[model samples]
Every structure is written in C-alpha cells, then in structure tokens.
Target: GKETITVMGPAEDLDDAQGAWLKTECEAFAKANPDFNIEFKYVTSSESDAKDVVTKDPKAAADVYMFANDQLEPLIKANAIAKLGGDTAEYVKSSNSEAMAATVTYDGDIYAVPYTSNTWFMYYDKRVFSEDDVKSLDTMLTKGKVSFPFDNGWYLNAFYAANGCTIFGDGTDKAAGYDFSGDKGTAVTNYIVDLFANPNFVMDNNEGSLGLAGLKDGSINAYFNGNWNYDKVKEALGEENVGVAALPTINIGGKDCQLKAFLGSKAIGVNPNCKNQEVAVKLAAFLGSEDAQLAHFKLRGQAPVNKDLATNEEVAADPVAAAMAKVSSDCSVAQPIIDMSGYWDAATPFGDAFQNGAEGQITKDNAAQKTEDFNTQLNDSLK
Candidate 1:
C-alpha cells in the first residue's frame, strides 16, 4: 500500500535547514525502504510565515509537510491534514515521544513525526558564567546578576516559568484557549525588563557568536540560547570551556528552576489530499525511526528525534545537545499549539515597541493595550 511521497518544507537555496537536512537522510531511507521513493520540495518562508503557506492549501501541495508545531493549527483546521491513527503496537513500541510528542499529537490524533528536537536552554561558557548564573534566571534577577540578551524572542520564559507561569496551561484542546495575560505575562515582562536594563548585556543580532566570544574573553558571563546553536558555540569556544544548564530557571520558592522554551518539534505530517499520502506516511514513519534520527543527528548538528538515539554517543558528545536532552527530560515543557491559534496581529507591537524605541518609552498600559488589540484581532482571525 506504500506509494511515492513528495515532501515540502522551508529551506534555503532549495537546500537548507531541516528540509535540505532531511533530503540527505532520505537517501539512506530509500536504501532501507526500497519500495518507496521520496522527494523533498523546499519552500522559502520564515518560521512565523510557514503556516501561511500551508494554510493556503489545506491539502498542501506536498504529500508530507514538515514544519514547526506553531504552524500545525492552521493546517489542521483547514482540513488539510489527515485523520491519523497509527498501528497501536507500533506506536507503543516507538520511542522519542518526549521529543516527538508536541509535533506528532494534536487533538487525540497522531499527525506528524518530529525528529529534530527544539529547546531554548542557557548556553554558557563553562569557564565564564559561574555556577550561580547558570543555575536559574530567578537567581540572577533576585541577586541582580543576569546579563540579558533581550532581543531573543521568549527569553522571558525563564522568569515566568520561575514564577510558575505557563503560556498555555497544561492539557490539549482545553489548554489551547489559555491566555497570556495575568501573572505569567507580567512576570515574563518584569524579567525581560530587568535583563534589558543590565548594562553588561550586549544587544547583538548575533548573540550566540558573541556569547561564545564572551566565554573566550570574559566580557560577559552567560547567555540564554538554544540547543541548535551548540555547534557554533563549540566551534567558537572549544568543547572543554563550554557547557549548558537547564534553561536557567525561575525556581518557584525552592523548586527546581523551570525554564520554558518555545518547545516543539520540526515535524513531518501527511496532507489529506495528497494523492500519494499512503506512501508519504510510510516515508514519514521511516524517517522518524531510530535509524534515521541517528543519521540525521550525526550528519547534521540537529538532535535526534528518537530518545534512544539521544543517548547515542555521537549526540551526547556535543555538550549542547546533551544538555538539551537533560532540559527535555527535566526542564522541558511543550509549547502550546494555542499560541499559534490566538491573535497574531498583537504580536507585532512587541517587536515594534522594542525595535522602534518604544521599549520603555511606551507605558505598560499602552503596551498591554496593544496586546489586547492583538488578542482581539487574533481571536477574530481564528473565529
């Protein structure tokens, strides 16, 4: 029943990021599944723009679609997705659910398989930021210690998580309607404002490279960064001097610091309308298997989707990836699909305020109002 699958995703120069990376792994996949043929089509779109492309065609042009969890809602609601249920035995036997669950499961159906793990952790120079800074963001804020890179989106997750706030409350469809207002949002804002005010924190578009350099020279201590950027940091600072911590947490009154990432997966899903969906699903499942995750991680800097593969020596060797696994195990929380569902228009002001010199100049009232406007627009859009 397997058929040829045509997959599409965001890539650069017709080959880049996960799509290009996936193509290289598929070469090996073809060897494992001789009856199947898979073709990857790369589309150019920023991560935020991905849902727009797929939503345009609920029955996306590609039989299999690979993108982040944020883009899943529009595609699912558009009826562009298939009603997915896998062989239960196979499902139960599958590993990497911790890494794969956010992308694959939505509203009780298995929609996609995410092999690439995504988490925002505090990437630090094992030599530079003392153990104190790496422990938790709350510790930094309380002691007035954090040197922040405010430019990074969702950096405040540390403070909010520390204060026991979650963007989307736990649960599935019910959680999707969770609002970002109240204590959580305020905690996030206060944390970010404090970081923004830190004089030592350099505002660099390339914060990652700069952090690695800081580790080398000691101008800065630590920075909140991502698992994906591990290789670059290692290349910049060398392996021994660099290490990671659970995304520096907020530590709610003595609990382990809980830092939230814009956690989700780079997933592969089937298009309901794809003439070749059966084949696409087969290829997708194969791509998600342990063998493929290892190939993908080793050949690329990406973390493997299979948890078993995460413990594989190659993945553990990279300090960043290993720490991310720990973060996934201990500190990680799934980014809610509802964040994607709400008012997207309101988000523009957050960026605009920061970029347009309104960060402090604009009153919190005005800022919150803009967010309220955004929520209304977003709610209407979803409706």
Candidate 2:
C-alpha cells in the first residue's frame, strides 16, 4: 500500500538578507517538485540578526531560514537547527572550502548549508571611478567620495589587516591570539590619521540607509559592504551604473597593501521544529545547490560556495559575485566563531582612538606608543 504525498509548504521569514531572496527559489521549488505548493511570507530580519530572531522561537520560525556563520553555534545549542545528512551532508562537505564546510558543521555533525561567504566588498559608481581608480584607496580618496565605518571594529579591521595585524592567526587558530601590535599596528594608526584628513572621506556605517541615500543622491560614490547591500545599491545607482570589486589597496608606510575583509559563511539551516523534515531539509539543500546558488548570484549577487559554479562562464563574468568570491579567497581572514574571548572588547579601543579628537590623540609623534599600548591591551585580553 502507498500513502500518497499531499504537499509541502508558509515560509514566513525575515527577508532581504536571506528571506526575501528565497521567495523565487521557493516558487522554483514548487515547480520542481510539482507535488508541493510553497508559499513564502516576507518578514524582515537581517541574517546578521538571525540568532535573536530564530533562537527566540525555533518552533515558530521558518522551516528553512538563512543565518550567519557566527549565529550557527547558538542555533545548535538552542536546539533550533536540524542535523543535515545523506546527500546533503556529503555534498556540503565535499563541495565547499574547508573553512566554509566548517561553518555548517559543529560537534562533527553538519547542521546547515552554506550558500556564500560572509564578508564585505566594495560597491562603487561606475561613472565616478574608473576600473583602475577603484583599485587603490588613496586613488579613490583623492578622486571621489569614500565612506568607511571608522567607528566599527568590523569595518575598521580592514585597515588593521592591511597593516599586518591578525585575528585568530590565519583565522583557524583560536590560541594564536589576535596580534595587532608591532610596527605594523603603528603604520595603520598613521594611515588612519591621514585617512580622516582627506576631504573626500566620510565616516559612514551604511547608517540609517545613509550609504544607500548617498548612492542615490550622488553624495557617496563608493562604499564597502557585502552582497546584502546589492539591492539597495542597485536601486540607488541602477544596475548598469553600479560597480563591484574586492576591497581596495591602501598605501601604508610606502607600500601598497590590500585591505582585508573578515570572512565567515552565511548558510541555510533547517529548523528542528520543521513539520516536514524531509521537505525542509531538501529545500535547504536545494537552496544551497548549484542551480539555486546561480539563481541567487543572478538575482541577488550572492557569492556561491559550490565548487563547480566557480568555473561557470556567467559567474566568471558577473562582477558582484566574482568580486565577493575574490575577496573571500584572497583578501580575508576567517572570523573565528568559536570564541571572541574579549576580542570585540579589545578591538574597539583601537578604532576608538580614531574617533572624534582622534587626530590630536593619534599624532605621528605618539602613534608608535599608542599602537604599542593598544597591541599590548589587545594581546593582554587573551590572558
């Protein structure tokens, strides 16, 4: 005797960064299965905030939802995520980079599906900066308006990365300790001194949609962010006018250095409370699939984690995905999700030194001493 399957599907979710993007994929899944009717209800919860949203009520959250790499551990401990196995586990393990594969796995069990790297790249206006001009931060600063999150540790870390500081040492070593001292740290302090002095510099944190508004009104020509801002940037500047690239170079102490981005993976996880376990897990895998990843890249500019997709002609040609992929591979450090261990508390003062009255506080005369103290404070946190 055969029990016929009736259907599979309301995904009410925090859209935009992940949810809204899944709507089309849901429709495509509907057609692919033919037996399932999927309906996606749009709710707005940024992926970065997934921990707060989903952990608050795993039983009530969407069956398949998007979350950041840093959010995975809490989701697992909260019993909010389902274990992925079978082809899903094998595919994710074999297809993704070791670092990315690690994002979905905890306690030796794969818990989610990684769709893209969690990191930010540059978004620029094609008209304001030529391709070559966008390659160097100094070049862009002199030629056009540049916005940076000077007050934010995450965004400001890029400069530290440029000057040879590190978080988690290659990002894989938790015990390696975050080294931000030495002469390298001082170089960045001096660079920051020079950065704020530039007439075209703006301290923007993608604030209140400030970056979007700037892009819209022509006040900001270039900004650093991940794919999450693609829709806003595209809407502001038009697709043809928007230019995407990995982070640019900054001249530090007479040498050109590429700005490094923090790296993590944004993944889709199955809710343990999902009524249709098979269906939800399948959907999660499907969304993380090559076809779905391609759709995501095409529709939303998310970089793909699938191995084969890297060689796809369209991906090779796509500016946004290519840039994100490049940044994730070349100019980024793994964001250690295990334990920050006062990393945030420690990283703040370094950036804070550059805030208001920063110029006076971090003069070339004392920048060396300031960074040495900052480095010691940063290193001392580990002990």
Candidate 3:
C-alpha cells in the first residue's frame, strides 16, 4: 500500500493548468490502483535524461518514463527497458495506428505504449498562401519564403523516401540494409539541386532562433516544423493567420510525389529494474489509455495516438493535430531503429553539398555521381 513508483514526463515546464491537470491525473491513477503510489518526476529533456538515467543507474530510474520512439533502439540494446505482453500488447495494437504501434515494437516484442505521434508537417501563413498554394513544394518555393533544414539528415530523409527509397527495410529487418543510391535517389538529388537555387528558398539549420523570429519579423512566411514548435509558431503568426497542412509534393522528374516525413511517436516505457514491474507496466499502459490521451490532448494540445480520441470532435477540429494525423497516415514513413551509424555521417556531406549548391562537390551535372559515391559510403559504413 505504501509502495511509491516514480513517473517521468514533461510537466516541469508546462503551464499552471497543465501541471494541475497532471497532478490530478496522477492522484486519480493512484486512487484507482490502491496497490501503489505514483510520484511524478519532471524531465525537461525526456530523451537525453532517459538515456542517462537508464544507462547510468537503471535501478534508480523512474519506474515509468516518457521518451521519443527513436531512442528505443539504444534503450533496448542496453537492456534498460521492459517489454509488454498479452493483454497490454493487444490493447496497444488495437488502440493506435500500425505505424505508431510499430514505433514501440522491436524484434516482435512490444516495448512501450505510444501516447502521441511525433512528426513534422507544413505550417503556413494563410495570408501568404492559399490551400491550393500550399499543396506543392514547387509552388511554395516560387511563391513564398520556405524554411527547410536541408543540412539536417532527419529532414533530408523525407525527400529520399518520397522518391521510393527505403532504409533498413520496414525497420524490423536490419539485414536488408539501405537502398538510397539508385535512380530514385538521383531524381531526388537532381530535384534538390534545382530547388535550392530558388530565390524564395531558405536553407536554415534547425538550431537558429527556433525560426519563430523570422515568422514574427515577416522574413519567412512558411515553415516545415513539428508539433513541438506549434505554440511558439501560433504565437508568432497569430491564431487566425496560422495554417496547417501535410507536406507539399516536390516535383521529381516531371512527376509529383508527396514529401514523406518520418512518423515517430512519443511513448511511455517501463524500466526493467523497477521495484514493482507489474504496477509500473500498468501505469505506463494507463498513461496511453483513451481517457488519459484525451486529457493530454485537452491540456497540451498534443495529438493523441489513441484511435478514438484522435477522431473526437475537439481533436478533429484542431487544424494542426488534424493535419498531422492525416499526413502521418497518408504520407509519413516509419523511422527505423536499426544500426544507423553511417546514416547521419553520409548525410552530412550530401546535405552540405546541397546547402552549398553549385559551389560545392554536388552540382546539377554531377549529382548522380556524387549520390552514388555517398550512397556507397553509407552502405559500407552500415556493414
């Protein structure tokens, strides 16, 4: 009855209302399960903190904690996390989208319960672009200032995948390896070479001023960002002018293809070293329950992964969440968790080439050759 289980989440920096709501939910959860008490720990950097805590002292880590699905590979490799089974696994499969559910699963084992989908979509200024105007990246490039992080590997993968490239093959099978050096990859590289030379294009890195200052100061009218930056974006663009939509299609060899972003998830996992494994697993599952997800959406404006809660009127009416959910379902690709040592390393040079345009190693005339060279480097490193 006196057992205390620690729960780590992102509530320390939240507003008063959100903090209060979190406390209320924790209290309610404790009351419902009288076997243990829930103690909340604030983790501002959920992913980094989870890595440090789980790696340094698994036994001392929180019983249940929140983390981005991308970090699951390392956690699982370290044997710092626990897997779900039977009824909990079944509930997870039934409640979330296949892509989201797959985020928490590794090697046929369910590792966590997904709470929210994590991915990027387009946020435009309605005053600058209409619904039709935002449909094509070609159009946006010609019409308004578009902020895209071409130098970042994560964002760069979107274009490559949209052109039919696959990494680690469905993420479940690591042996198949990467396949981004073919004709499809050449097509994407050629397209990027032309796209970067546009007058309205802004090749901004991910780290500068969060890009809200540009939106506020009238420098950039549109952004390709995720839900994490939504609040500040809304604040800068004003509620009435901000628009949300799926990624715009880029022109590839005269054909248009959707700019497929990575569909990731923010999930809750149990520590294998927890004192109360059963109770901790139950709490982790409860955090992603329909009621809890709905309350989360209400408090944080985050899109819920729960199928029914995602379809509710309130969530459906939310332009950002609605657009994100649609994009994730229709165009986003699953983020792989296999050995990716060469992924970023190879991407850095290619991304740098794009950012430098004709001045660098990759130019329109030699893009295919450069792509093949880098692709070989990537595959070799993967092996």
Clashes of each: 5, 3, 0
lDDT of 2 at 148: 81
- Candidate 1: tens digits of C-alpha lDDT, residues 156-275: 344445555544456255434535555445544544444455564444342356665665565655656765556666666677766677766553334554566566777666778877
lDDT of 3: 0.77
Model 2 lDDT tens row, 30-133: 67886665555545556766787888887777677777887776788889988999999998998898888987777799998898878888899999999999
Model 3 TM: 0.88
Query: How far does residue 335 in candidate 3 sit from its true spot (Å)?
Result: 2.6
Shift in Å, residue 33, candidate 2: 5.2
Give the distance in Å from residue 154's predicted Cα in candidate 1 to where it truly belongs: 4.5
Off by over 4 Å in 1: 1-5, 9-20, 36-49, 58-60, 86-93, 138-155, 171-188, 203-221, 250-257, 343-348, 351-356, 359-383
How many Å off is the CA of 75 in candidate 2? 3.1
TM-scores, all candidates, are: 0.75, 0.82, 0.88
Clashing pairs in 1: 3-279, 58-80, 162-250, 343-378, 346-374
Tens-digit lDDT track of model 3 for 1-383: 36766777664323574444445566667778865655555444444246656767777777788887877888888787898997789989999877788888888899999888888888888889999999998887777888777766768889988888888876556787888877889999888877777778777664435456778877788887777667778889998999999988888878998888888888888989888888878877788888887877777677888887855999989987888878877868888767465786677667777765335657788888988887788779865
Q: lDDT for every model?
A: 0.58, 0.76, 0.77
Candidate 2, run of 10 with poorest lDDT: 2-11
